[PDB]
Design a binder for this molecule. Structure first.
Ligand SMILES: O=c1ccn([C@@H]2O[C@H](COP(=O)(O)OP(=O)(O)OP(=O)(O)O)[C@@H](O)[C@H]2O)c(=O)[nH]1
Length: 585
């Protein structure tokens, strides 16, 4: 593509004061012609960066200088306080008139919602070699996070629901593989792959090389999602297609928080009720939490207030210097972002989806100033809130119960350490446990008589903590529709005649109505896969069998003829699916 002369001009340019990338061409011949294919390739790699980053590599270096100087300084705001527009959501396990109104209002709005899934990470930090959306939400059905989100979206928004997945070099191919393998048919899905950015070996922003001598690359952060969307087409801009088709909201979700399918309808309803352009999904936060705080900020004493997320580390540092006259006052943002689409698009078009950047290098020492590993510039998807002036827009937050926040983000060992400090585990074990409990709390809210012990049923991480799983009740999207309390009530029309023992397992797939049941064991009930077909009705059912059990993965663990996978090891237990009754037709 690019010319021999253009590559020469760029090389020369990069060697000028303020750029100083001479180290990249150490011992090269005078002109491009004389350069070998390998050298020609590196210059090409530098050159093509322009169609990936605003201003290309030259501006990247300049930005690096600015940010590196900036981050060497002390972060501080001239003003910081509670956001004006904070709204408390009613409990998810109480079927009050208010909860009902918000759920049904939000559910209608789901019909005009665009969904965006941010999925550019592996679960390595968890102990998981594959993509995080391939993690199961729970091992009873093994439904992946990916299918979980996609089927819900297609349920509430129909088959042609507009859906974006942002991937990366790490997750992209595998994401496409998973889509194919699960036979997911999503006509209006757009998979947008973020590009990695160059790295700085040092504080002078000298570009880093890898082991082969090629330019080193690292992720630019989830902030890329806005740029990717701004540049996506269907020759018509993606966002224009959405707008013209009548879509009115857009929501952004993380890769392993199943709670989003519960919070979203509520947030949508509240966004409409309080005319919110941007609505941060929040929870009350404990000061000892790697979660950001939603704050009304003012960077300089002359600026306007901005409503935006303030990262935990920053808020810590910020506080000690400028104190001016059991959770944090400010809400904790879980990064489920809800927008009025028209407002989002306006800001998008104005900024080209570019959001403020930062750099956060890891040093070898406090004093030696040397990097431990090459740094790169990053961006956060939530920082788009900075483009929404308080004069033109209403940016606020909705506060939910902490229980509705169920990320799978820590390894078993990390969770052990965390639990000891009295903090949340947020590992695969507690994620799975929380999902089962969530179903139970929702079901009880409509009158299902679920009596079960709160005692843990298995201990993980060398006996560090326990979780319980049973009773296990999982209804698919054809059965439970949107998951609203009203939708659940359709499955259980006369709840008081349904008696699910605390040790039982109930799996429901398809169009099923359960009127009366006594279950002591494991049961799967299957109905029509078509949401519009006549339902399989269960009445006067009695099922007794050995059902399922759970036990910890033993420390002894090693050995051939083994069936333990990473999925098992990252949660520290295994379901034994001993027996299972099936009711079809
Ligand atoms: O460059 C990135 C970084 C993060 N993310 C998205 O970050 C959410 C939170 O990302 P975090 O930054 O909070 O965690 P992480 O990336 O270290 O690990 P993952 O979450 O990727 O597993 C997930 O949606 C993650 O895929 C991206 O999509 N791209």
């Amino acid at each position: 593509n690019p010319s021999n002369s253009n590559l020469q001009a760029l090389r020369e340019e990069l060697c000028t004061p303020g750029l100083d990338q001479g180290h990249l061409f150490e011992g090269w011949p005078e002109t491009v012609d004389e350069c070998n294919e390998r050298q020609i390739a590196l210059l090409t790699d530098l050159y093509m960066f322009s169609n990936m980053y605003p201003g290309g590599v030259a501006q990247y270096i300049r930005n690096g200088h600015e940010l590196l100087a900036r981050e060497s300084e002390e972060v501080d705001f001239a003003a910081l306080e509670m956001p004006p527009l904070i709204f408390e959501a009613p409990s998810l396990h109480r079927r009050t008139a208010e909860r009902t109104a918000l759920e049904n209002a939000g559910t209608a709005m789901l019909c005009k919602t665009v969904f965006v899934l941010v999925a550019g990470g592996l679960g390595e930090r968890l102990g998981y070699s594959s993509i995080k959306v391939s993690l199961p939400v729970e091992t009873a059905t093994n439904t992946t996070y990916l299918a979980y989100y996609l089927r819900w979206a297609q349920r509430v928004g129909g088959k042609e629901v507009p859906f974006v997945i942002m991937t990366s070099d790490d997750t992209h191919d595998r994401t496409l593989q998973l889509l194919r393998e699960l036979q997911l048919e999503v006509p209006n899905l757009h998979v947008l792959k973020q590009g990695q950015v160059f790295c700085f070996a040092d504080s002078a922003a000298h570009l880093a090389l890898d082991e082969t001598g090629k330019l080193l690359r690292k992720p630019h952060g989830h902030g890329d999602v806005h740029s990717l969307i701004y540049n996506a087409t269907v020759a018509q801009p993606l966002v224009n297609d959405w707008l013209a088709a009548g879509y009115e909201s857009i929501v952004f979700i993380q890769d392993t928080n199943a709670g989003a399918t519960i919070t979203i309808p509520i947030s949508l309803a509240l966004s409409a009720e309080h005319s919110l352009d941007m609505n941060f999904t929040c929870i009350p936060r404990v000061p000892k939490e790697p979660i950001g705080l939603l704050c009304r900020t003012k960077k300089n004493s002359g600026d306007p207030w901005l409503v935006a997320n303030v990262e935990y580390n920053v808020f810590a540092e910020v506080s000690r210097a400028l104190n001016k006259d059991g959770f944090s006052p400010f809400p904790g943002s879980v990064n489920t972002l809800v927008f009025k689409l028209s407002s989002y698009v306006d800001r998008l078009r104005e900024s080209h989806g570019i959001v403020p950047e930062f750099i956060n290098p890891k040093y070898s020492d406090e004093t030696r100033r040397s990097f431990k590993k090459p740094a790169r510039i990053e961006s956060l998807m939530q920082d788009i809130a900075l483009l929404f002036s308080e004069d033109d827009y209403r940016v606020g937050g909705t506060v939910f119960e902490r229980f509705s926040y169920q990320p799978v983000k820590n390894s078993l060992e990390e969770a052990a350490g965390l639990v000891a400090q009295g903090n949340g585990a947020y590992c695969a074990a507690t994620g799975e446990a929380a999902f089962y409990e969530l179903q139970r709390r929702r079901l009880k809210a409509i009158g299902l008589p679920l009596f079960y012990s709160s005692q843990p049923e298995v201990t993980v991480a060398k006996d560090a903590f326990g979780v319980r799983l049973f009773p296990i009740i999982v209804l698919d999207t054809v059965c439970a529709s949107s998951g609203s309390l009203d939708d659940l009530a359709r499955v259980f029309p006369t709840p008081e005649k349904v008696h699910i023992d605390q040790h039982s397992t109930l799996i429901v797939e398809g169009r099923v109505i359960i009127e009366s049941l006594e279950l002591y064991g494991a049961l799967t009930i299957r109905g029509p896969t078509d949401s519009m077909a006549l339902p399989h009705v269960v009445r006067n059912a009695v099922v007794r069998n050995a059902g399922w059990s759970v036990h910890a993965i033993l420390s002894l663990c090693a050995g051939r003829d083994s069936r333990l996978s990473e999925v098992d090891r990252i949660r520290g237990f295994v379901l034994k699916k001993t027996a299972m009754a099936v009711m079809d037709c």
